[PDB]
Tab-separated table of N, CA and C in Angstrom:
chain	number	residue	atom	x	y	z
A	1	UNK	N	-16.167	28.245	12.046
A	1	UNK	CA	-16.440	27.922	13.438
A	1	UNK	C	-17.930	27.858	13.744
A	2	UNK	N	-18.769	28.574	12.991
A	2	UNK	CA	-20.203	28.536	13.258
A	2	UNK	C	-20.782	27.147	13.020
A	3	UNK	N	-20.277	26.423	12.025
A	3	UNK	CA	-20.587	25.009	11.883
A	3	UNK	C	-19.514	24.116	12.486
A	4	UNK	N	-18.461	24.697	13.051
A	4	UNK	CA	-17.372	23.903	13.597
A	4	UNK	C	-16.715	23.019	12.561
A	5	UNK	N	-16.595	23.511	11.331
A	5	UNK	CA	-16.143	22.693	10.214
A	5	UNK	C	-14.867	23.301	9.642
A	6	UNK	N	-14.161	24.079	10.466
A	6	UNK	CA	-12.906	24.677	10.025
A	6	UNK	C	-11.916	23.612	9.575
A	7	UNK	N	-11.815	22.520	10.326
A	7	UNK	CA	-10.911	21.422	10.007
A	7	UNK	C	-11.493	20.637	8.838
A	8	UNK	N	-10.930	20.841	7.649
A	8	UNK	CA	-11.395	20.152	6.453
A	8	UNK	C	-10.379	20.345	5.339
A	9	UNK	N	-10.618	19.647	4.229
A	9	UNK	CA	-9.776	19.804	3.049
A	9	UNK	C	-10.157	21.060	2.274
A	10	UNK	N	-11.392	21.112	1.785
A	10	UNK	CA	-11.930	22.276	1.104
A	10	UNK	C	-13.083	22.847	1.916
A	11	UNK	N	-13.669	23.929	1.405
A	11	UNK	CA	-14.691	24.675	2.136
A	11	UNK	C	-15.587	25.431	1.172
A	12	UNK	N	-16.769	24.898	0.876
A	12	UNK	CA	-17.753	25.663	0.106
A	12	UNK	C	-18.473	26.683	0.974
A	13	UNK	N	-18.853	27.793	0.342
A	13	UNK	CA	-19.587	28.858	1.022
A	13	UNK	C	-20.307	29.694	-0.028
A	14	UNK	N	-21.625	29.552	-0.111
A	14	UNK	CA	-22.447	30.365	-0.997
A	14	UNK	C	-23.248	31.349	-0.159
A	15	UNK	N	-23.245	32.616	-0.566
A	15	UNK	CA	-23.854	33.665	0.238
A	15	UNK	C	-24.209	34.843	-0.662
A	16	UNK	N	-25.088	35.706	-0.155
A	16	UNK	CA	-25.689	36.779	-0.943
A	16	UNK	C	-25.702	38.057	-0.115
A	17	UNK	N	-25.438	39.185	-0.771
A	17	UNK	CA	-25.562	40.485	-0.133
A	17	UNK	C	-27.007	40.975	-0.185
A	18	UNK	N	-27.350	41.841	0.764
A	18	UNK	CA	-28.690	42.400	0.854
A	18	UNK	C	-28.691	43.838	0.334
A	19	UNK	N	-29.814	44.531	0.503
A	19	UNK	CA	-29.942	45.908	0.080
A	19	UNK	C	-30.394	46.044	-1.363
A	20	UNK	N	-30.388	47.294	-1.832
A	20	UNK	CA	-30.759	47.570	-3.219
A	20	UNK	C	-29.910	46.792	-4.217
A	21	UNK	N	-28.569	46.760	-4.122
A	21	UNK	CA	-27.799	45.861	-4.992
A	21	UNK	C	-27.840	44.435	-4.465
A	22	UNK	N	-28.601	43.583	-5.142
A	22	UNK	CA	-28.744	42.186	-4.756
A	22	UNK	C	-27.826	41.320	-5.606
A	23	UNK	N	-26.882	40.648	-4.948
A	23	UNK	CA	-25.888	39.849	-5.649
A	23	UNK	C	-25.381	38.739	-4.736
A	24	UNK	N	-25.189	37.558	-5.317
A	24	UNK	CA	-24.812	36.357	-4.586
A	24	UNK	C	-23.320	36.090	-4.737
A	25	UNK	N	-22.861	35.010	-4.108
A	25	UNK	CA	-21.456	34.628	-4.135
A	25	UNK	C	-21.324	33.112	-4.077
A	26	UNK	N	-20.216	32.623	-4.625
A	26	UNK	CA	-19.781	31.253	-4.412
A	26	UNK	C	-18.328	31.302	-3.965
A	27	UNK	N	-17.968	30.404	-3.054
A	27	UNK	CA	-16.740	30.539	-2.288
A	27	UNK	C	-16.168	29.163	-1.999
A	28	UNK	N	-14.847	29.046	-2.095
A	28	UNK	CA	-14.134	27.871	-1.612
A	28	UNK	C	-12.870	28.335	-0.904
A	29	UNK	N	-12.622	27.769	0.270
A	29	UNK	CA	-11.407	28.009	1.033
A	29	UNK	C	-10.751	26.681	1.381
A	30	UNK	N	-9.422	26.675	1.413
A	30	UNK	CA	-8.686	25.451	1.708
A	30	UNK	C	-7.283	25.825	2.177
A	31	UNK	N	-6.513	24.812	2.581
A	31	UNK	CA	-5.200	25.020	3.177
A	31	UNK	C	-4.296	23.812	2.955
A	32	UNK	N	-3.787	23.608	1.740
A	32	UNK	CA	-2.945	22.431	1.480
A	32	UNK	C	-1.569	22.580	2.112
A	33	UNK	N	-1.079	21.492	2.698
A	33	UNK	CA	0.240	21.466	3.316
A	33	UNK	C	0.941	20.157	2.963
A	34	UNK	N	1.003	19.849	1.668
A	34	UNK	CA	1.365	18.509	1.221
A	34	UNK	C	2.730	18.118	1.773
A	35	UNK	N	2.891	16.837	2.102
A	35	UNK	CA	4.044	16.397	2.875
A	35	UNK	C	4.602	15.091	2.335
A	36	UNK	N	5.743	14.696	2.890
A	36	UNK	CA	6.400	13.443	2.551
A	36	UNK	C	6.926	12.814	3.828
A	37	UNK	N	6.451	11.604	4.135
A	37	UNK	CA	6.897	10.926	5.346
A	37	UNK	C	8.396	10.663	5.328
A	38	UNK	N	8.983	10.522	4.140
A	38	UNK	CA	10.407	10.238	3.973
A	38	UNK	C	11.002	11.287	3.044
A	39	UNK	N	11.379	12.455	3.571
A	39	UNK	CA	11.871	13.530	2.697
A	39	UNK	C	13.118	13.162	1.918
A	40	UNK	N	13.946	12.265	2.440
A	40	UNK	CA	15.195	11.905	1.791
A	40	UNK	C	15.060	10.700	0.870
A	41	UNK	N	13.867	10.115	0.769
A	41	UNK	CA	13.676	8.953	-0.090
A	41	UNK	C	13.884	9.288	-1.562
A	42	UNK	N	13.376	10.427	-2.012
A	42	UNK	CA	13.435	10.812	-3.412
A	42	UNK	C	14.699	11.609	-3.696
A	43	UNK	N	15.274	11.361	-4.869
A	43	UNK	CA	16.456	12.069	-5.339
A	43	UNK	C	16.063	12.838	-6.588
A	44	UNK	N	16.274	14.146	-6.570
A	44	UNK	CA	15.967	15.010	-7.703
A	44	UNK	C	17.245	15.150	-8.522
A	45	UNK	N	17.327	14.399	-9.613
A	45	UNK	CA	18.490	14.476	-10.485
A	45	UNK	C	18.242	15.547	-11.535
A	46	UNK	N	19.060	16.593	-11.521
A	46	UNK	CA	18.950	17.679	-12.491
A	46	UNK	C	19.770	17.287	-13.714
A	47	UNK	N	19.079	16.904	-14.781
A	47	UNK	CA	19.751	16.470	-15.993
A	47	UNK	C	20.328	17.665	-16.748
A	48	UNK	N	21.434	17.413	-17.440
A	48	UNK	CA	22.093	18.435	-18.241
A	48	UNK	C	22.966	17.795	-19.316
B	1	UNK	N	2.091	29.146	24.910
B	1	UNK	CA	1.322	28.089	25.558
B	1	UNK	C	0.287	27.496	24.607
B	2	UNK	N	-0.198	28.318	23.678
B	2	UNK	CA	-1.184	27.884	22.687
B	2	UNK	C	-0.444	27.436	21.424
B	3	UNK	N	0.488	26.506	21.627
B	3	UNK	CA	1.420	26.074	20.587
B	3	UNK	C	1.493	24.544	20.579
B	4	UNK	N	0.322	23.903	20.521
B	4	UNK	CA	0.223	22.447	20.572
B	4	UNK	C	1.116	21.748	19.547
B	5	UNK	N	0.874	21.995	18.257
B	5	UNK	CA	1.717	21.504	17.163
B	5	UNK	C	1.770	19.970	17.135
B	6	UNK	N	0.611	19.383	16.847
B	6	UNK	CA	0.504	17.935	16.728
B	6	UNK	C	1.269	17.425	15.511
B	7	UNK	N	1.756	16.191	15.606
B	7	UNK	CA	2.371	15.520	14.472
B	7	UNK	C	1.869	14.090	14.363
B	8	UNK	N	2.243	13.442	13.262
B	8	UNK	CA	1.928	12.038	13.028
B	8	UNK	C	3.098	11.329	12.356
B	9	UNK	N	4.315	11.823	12.571
B	9	UNK	CA	5.466	11.293	11.854
B	9	UNK	C	6.480	10.732	12.838
B	10	UNK	N	6.869	9.479	12.616
B	10	UNK	CA	7.899	8.801	13.400
B	10	UNK	C	8.808	8.001	12.472
B	11	UNK	N	9.222	8.625	11.371
B	11	UNK	CA	9.933	7.931	10.302
B	11	UNK	C	11.188	7.241	10.815
B	12	UNK	N	11.337	5.963	10.466
B	12	UNK	CA	12.532	5.201	10.842
B	12	UNK	C	13.654	5.440	9.836
B	13	UNK	N	13.445	4.998	8.589
B	13	UNK	CA	14.367	5.178	7.469
B	13	UNK	C	15.822	5.045	7.902
B	14	UNK	N	16.195	3.893	8.459
B	14	UNK	CA	17.411	3.816	9.252
B	14	UNK	C	18.318	2.627	8.965
B	15	UNK	N	17.876	1.625	8.206
B	15	UNK	CA	18.637	0.386	8.127
B	15	UNK	C	18.515	-0.262	6.757
B	16	UNK	N	19.474	-1.149	6.486
B	16	UNK	CA	19.485	-2.058	5.339
B	16	UNK	C	20.286	-3.268	5.811
B	17	UNK	N	19.595	-4.374	6.070
B	17	UNK	CA	20.232	-5.479	6.775
B	17	UNK	C	19.510	-6.785	6.498
B	18	UNK	N	20.237	-7.746	5.926
B	18	UNK	CA	19.862	-9.154	5.830
B	18	UNK	C	21.112	-9.998	5.625
B	19	UNK	N	21.511	-10.796	6.610
B	19	UNK	CA	22.735	-11.597	6.463
B	19	UNK	C	22.636	-12.634	5.355
B	20	UNK	N	21.632	-13.506	5.472
B	20	UNK	CA	21.285	-14.540	4.499
B	20	UNK	C	22.296	-15.680	4.456
B	21	UNK	N	23.464	-15.507	5.068
B	21	UNK	CA	24.475	-16.554	4.997
B	21	UNK	C	24.298	-17.602	6.077
B	22	UNK	N	23.883	-17.200	7.272
B	22	UNK	CA	23.389	-18.139	8.264
B	22	UNK	C	22.198	-18.924	7.739
B	23	UNK	N	21.461	-18.352	6.792
B	23	UNK	CA	20.400	-19.044	6.078
B	23	UNK	C	20.859	-19.696	4.781
B	24	UNK	N	21.841	-19.135	4.081
B	24	UNK	CA	22.447	-19.782	2.923
B	24	UNK	C	23.380	-20.918	3.295
B	25	UNK	N	24.100	-20.789	4.400
B	25	UNK	CA	25.177	-21.703	4.744
B	25	UNK	C	24.985	-22.411	6.071
B	26	UNK	N	24.438	-21.737	7.070
B	26	UNK	CA	24.408	-22.241	8.435
B	26	UNK	C	23.033	-22.798	8.789
B	27	UNK	N	22.422	-23.555	7.871
B	27	UNK	CA	21.039	-23.974	8.073
B	27	UNK	C	20.868	-24.797	9.340
B	28	UNK	N	21.949	-25.360	9.868
B	28	UNK	CA	21.892	-26.293	10.982
B	28	UNK	C	22.619	-25.724	12.193
B	29	UNK	N	21.920	-25.703	13.322
B	29	UNK	CA	22.440	-25.177	14.572
B	29	UNK	C	22.506	-26.295	15.600
B	30	UNK	N	23.494	-26.217	16.482
B	30	UNK	CA	23.656	-27.279	17.463
B	30	UNK	C	24.071	-26.714	18.814
B	31	UNK	N	23.170	-26.688	19.787
B	31	UNK	CA	23.557	-26.299	21.143
B	31	UNK	C	24.479	-27.337	21.763
B	32	UNK	N	25.277	-26.879	22.718
B	32	UNK	CA	26.232	-27.739	23.394
B	32	UNK	C	25.891	-27.855	24.872
B	33	UNK	N	26.204	-29.022	25.429
B	33	UNK	CA	26.291	-29.177	26.873
B	33	UNK	C	27.752	-29.329	27.283
B	34	UNK	N	28.675	-29.278	26.327
B	34	UNK	CA	30.087	-29.523	26.554
B	34	UNK	C	30.839	-28.204	26.660
B	35	UNK	N	31.746	-28.145	27.635
B	35	UNK	CA	32.560	-26.951	27.838
B	35	UNK	C	33.395	-26.646	26.598
B	36	UNK	N	34.045	-27.663	26.045
B	36	UNK	CA	34.845	-27.508	24.840
B	36	UNK	C	34.282	-28.365	23.712
B	37	UNK	N	34.805	-28.145	22.507
B	37	UNK	CA	34.272	-28.748	21.291
B	37	UNK	C	35.423	-29.210	20.410
B	38	UNK	N	35.331	-30.438	19.911
B	38	UNK	CA	36.224	-30.938	18.878
B	38	UNK	C	35.578	-30.826	17.504
B	39	UNK	N	36.431	-30.672	16.494
B	39	UNK	CA	35.994	-30.743	15.102
B	39	UNK	C	37.213	-31.124	14.269
B	40	UNK	N	37.292	-32.389	13.882
B	40	UNK	CA	38.428	-32.896	13.129
B	40	UNK	C	38.099	-32.980	11.646
B	41	UNK	N	39.028	-33.572	10.897
B	41	UNK	CA	38.881	-33.713	9.452
B	41	UNK	C	39.888	-34.758	8.990
B	42	UNK	N	39.482	-35.629	8.078
B	42	UNK	CA	40.415	-36.627	7.551
B	42	UNK	C	40.709	-36.313	6.086
B	43	UNK	N	41.971	-36.101	5.722
B	43	UNK	CA	42.331	-35.986	4.307
B	43	UNK	C	42.711	-37.331	3.709
B	44	UNK	N	42.159	-37.606	2.532
B	44	UNK	CA	42.534	-38.793	1.788
B	44	UNK	C	43.497	-38.438	0.678
B	45	UNK	N	44.690	-39.039	0.680
B	45	UNK	CA	45.729	-38.641	-0.268
B	45	UNK	C	46.696	-39.813	-0.437
B	46	UNK	N	46.610	-40.500	-1.575
B	46	UNK	CA	47.489	-41.637	-1.836
B	46	UNK	C	48.321	-41.392	-3.088
B	47	UNK	N	49.419	-42.130	-3.231
B	47	UNK	CA	50.150	-42.163	-4.486
B	47	UNK	C	49.612	-43.304	-5.342
């Protein structure tokens, strides 16, 4: 929200902690919700 | 109230239809100005 970029596919975020222990980070966040416009179009045939 | 829930789906997936016979057979159409219609036929058949 600070960049107003919540709405996206992926999300990079690189950041570092302060203090005596100095250490950085790399970050990705995302939210896939893959869909099908025609759920009944495909037939899953379970072979046997 | 904070439940907008936008969508983008209006799937039809509803029909399978093509006559093709009015196009295979009925290529010619004829409007009428007549209340009734005749349609005769002559058979040819000799000994």
